[PDB]
């Protein structure tokens with residue numbers, strides 16, 4: 001069935017990809033080559049053109065993503081040639097550098113060798129290439145709680161965190177054949193961070209908040225025409241709410257809302273005062289102001305929703321079915337102020353796409 | 363099939379109702395009486411105990427309702443005895459009066475005679491018993507746009523609105539046998555309205571905003587054990603966001619956000635300033651402050667979510683399956699600050715329940 005699963009996916013993808021690329025007449029001969037290759041080797045190798053468009057199609061099909069308008073401008077880096085951990089490390093270092101682009105972030109994906117027989121060639125342990133460590137000992141809570149399990153795993157491997165609230169986790173990945181992953185400390189010079197300040201409230205800096213510039217998802221599987229690229233980290237720029245309404249606001253994350261209420265000078269005593277709501281808005285104002293001031297790319301949820309409307313419009317104009325997850329597309333701040341809230345979305349899964357996969361630790 | 367549909371619903375409801383009421387031993391003899399009654403008349407009549415608990419069960423099963431914690435305290439008014447339009451009118455007048463309770467709102471439902479052969483005995487045209495009219499002529503937009511179609515219908519029937527932004531719509535309903543509905547102007551003395559002011563911004567009153575005290579849904583069908591109570595208006599108290607984040611904020615409603623931004627003294631120029639978000643919070647603060655100050659019952663979305671958590675906890679303790687619609691349960695303001703946002707809900711439909719039905723106009 002496995003060969004058959006692969007062959008059926010390959011047929012569907014190539015025909016669709018080549019159709020969009022206007023290479024319709026070449027589908028026949030390509031499907032032939034692919035078929036013999038699957039017969040012979042048990043798999044097939046994507047052309048760079050197929051891989052590139054396949055990763056763009058995958059982003060376009062990501063139901064939970066509000067930023068899909070710019071799907072076709074994705075910067076695809078083909079690193080199917082890597083064989084050593086030093087090569088993987090430098091590819092990851094390069095991704096961070098080129099995607100960051102001195103603050104003017106380029107949406108980028110680096111694609112490592114795919115699974116062979118379900119056997120991983122490269123196994124990335126990081127959720128994001130840049131993320132803060134998390135600790136808990138005797139109810140002493142430090143850093144990002146979401147990173148607690150990965151941090152413990154890393155500290156098993158000889159790494160030790162400084163135990164600030166913003167320890168940069170090292171890159172950690174495992175190569176095929178090795179029993180343990182290796183880890184590499186990130187060069188600080190490659191990592192842009194943004195101090196959080198408020199446009200008119202000076203005391204906001206007393207909170208000593210900051211966040212990292214680029215969100216680089218590194219734990220998802222890119223599937224393209226039957227081929228499983230388990231290692232393919234990708235990035236865009238942040239939508240402010242991700243930082244100000246979740247990362248810094250969630251009680252199971254940094255949980256900063258009470259401290260925010262204090263610095264903006266309001267009481268945090270009564271539900272009816274809506275102090276959490278007010279704190280959320282000022283914090284999200286702070287995030288947007290700070291990134292813009294530092295010259296780091298970011299988008300507000302209103303502008304992003306406007307862009308997604310254009311994405312919807314582009315889809316219908318192009319005769320493509322639109323899919324989406326309403327529960328993920330609405331922003332956690334003032335969602336009813338966006339058009340997204342006021343319509344429905346088909347949550348059907350279309351391939352190519354990005355998928356969750358089991359974590360190699362915990 | 364109709365008799366069979368009815369009989370199967372009746373079996374399921376009576377057994378469940380009597381079980382909860384601890385009248386398990388009486389299910390057998392009741393099911394017998396009901397069965398002969400269906401054979402003879404084509405239908406069966408609920409006891410007051412069955413009707414009362416049936417309407418409470420229906421509220422408990424309303425997947426979209428965040429306020430279900432107080433399901434068992436529902437005030438059920440049995441008006442299956444009405445036969446004249448004057449009786450219907452006075453029953454509706456009474457509902458408003460007793461539910462309002464001088465501001466200390468009582469969750470109440472008034473139950474009119476059920477459909478017979480799918481034939482309505484009483485046909486209520488109002489979406490809510492208390493709602494504001496809406497007009498549009500040559501792009502001259504007045505009042506609540508959501509009420510535009512009902513308003514036009516009423517003005518066909520000899521009624522005329524003053525064309526303020528807050529015209530109280532008359533009660534309008536049709537009796538079985540009559541071709542046209544009748545309409546009755548609401549006595550102002552029965553209708554509590556709340557002027558919208560802000561706790562610390564005096565200029566907020568310049569907006570001249572107000573809203574009505576009690577939300578009384580009057581266009582839904584209550585279904586209890588096969589019996590279709592198409593006419594059964596019900597009320598609770600408002601959650602603030604319903605007024606401040608939707609009714610007064612939506613662009614297709616009162617669309618007051620720009621005017622709010624002006625009175626609270628912020629620019630409405632840039633998306634990145636998050637001015638809509640800030641306006642939304644101050645407006646919702648205003649709503650809660652105003653209702654509390656007037657002595658009119660209201661609940662904030664944080665407290666309501668806390669209560670719904672208790673409802674969830676009560677359900678599991680009682681060995682009942684919990685159902686809910688996540689898309690309706692999250693508040694339109696700071697939803698990620700509630701526990702609801704961070705879990706999933708089974709959106710299965712359980713009867714008894716309240717349902718949408720076709721509007722008799724448009």
Ligand code: HEM
Nearest residue numbers: 059062064065066067107108234235236237238239299354
């Ligand atoms: C260009 C800037 C981008 C923005 C502003 C953006 C925005 C977002 C946001 C706000 C989410 C929801 C995450 C959350 O609620 O926590 C999301 C999810 C997602 N985005 Fe994007 N995105 C961008 C670029 C990309 C790119 C380049 C890809 C991949 C090629 C991508 C794929 C996804 C996927 C797969 C998810 C869902 C992740 C999951 O299921 O856990 N996005 N995006």
Ligand code: HEM
Nearest residue numbers: 421424426427428429469470596597598599600601661716
């Ligand atoms: C006691 C105070 C109550 C509060 C604060 C409350 C709160 C809410 C809220 C916020 C909604 C969502 C409406 C929207 O998003 O626009 C809702 C929906 C609903 N509530 Fe309640 N509710 C209350 C009482 C009741 C009562 C007494 C009933 C009936 C017995 C009821 C049945 C429903 C139903 C059926 C819906 C869904 C309406 C629809 O599908 O369009 N609720 N409730």
Ligand SMILES: Cc1cc(N)nc(COCC[C@@H](CN)OCc2cc(C)cc(N)n2)c1
Nearest residue numbers: 215216217219234235236237238239242356
């Ligand atoms: C617990 C958890 C597990 C898991 N697999 N994923 C998540 C969160 O979902 C994906 C990460 C979210 C966090 N805001 O960011 C998505 C995203 C991706 C990209 C490429 C850009 C962007 N701005 N935002 C959380």
Ligand SMILES: Cc1cc(N)nc(COCC[C@@H](CN)OCc2cc(C)cc(N)n2)c1
Nearest residue numbers: 577578579581596597598599600601604718
């Ligand atoms: C367009 C439309 C049609 C339709 N059938 N229903 C709606 C809105 O949903 C029901 C009304 C909503 C409006 N916030 O209020 C529900 C509600 C009911 C009750 C008993 C109490 C309460 N606080 N809130 C809108």
Ligand SMILES: C[C@H](O)[C@H](O)[C@H]1CNc2nc(N)[nH]c(=O)c2N1
Nearest residue numbers: 341342343344689690691692694
């Ligand atoms: C079309 C979309 O389902 C629509 O916005 C729904 C869902 N979310 C909602 N949530 C609430 N509380 N009230 C509503 O009227 C709606 N409308």
Ligand SMILES: C[C@H](O)[C@H](O)[C@H]1CNc2nc(N)[nH]c(=O)c2N1
Nearest residue numbers: 327328329330332703704705706
């Ligand atoms: C459990 C529930 O589905 C959960 O809150 C989901 C849905 N809504 C979300 N929406 C966004 N944007 N991001 C998230 O992580 C989630 N989490």
Ligand SMILES: [Cl-]
Nearest residue numbers: 215242243247
């Ligand atoms: Cl993040």
Ligand SMILES: [Cl-]
Nearest residue numbers: 577604605609
């Ligand atoms: Cl309403």
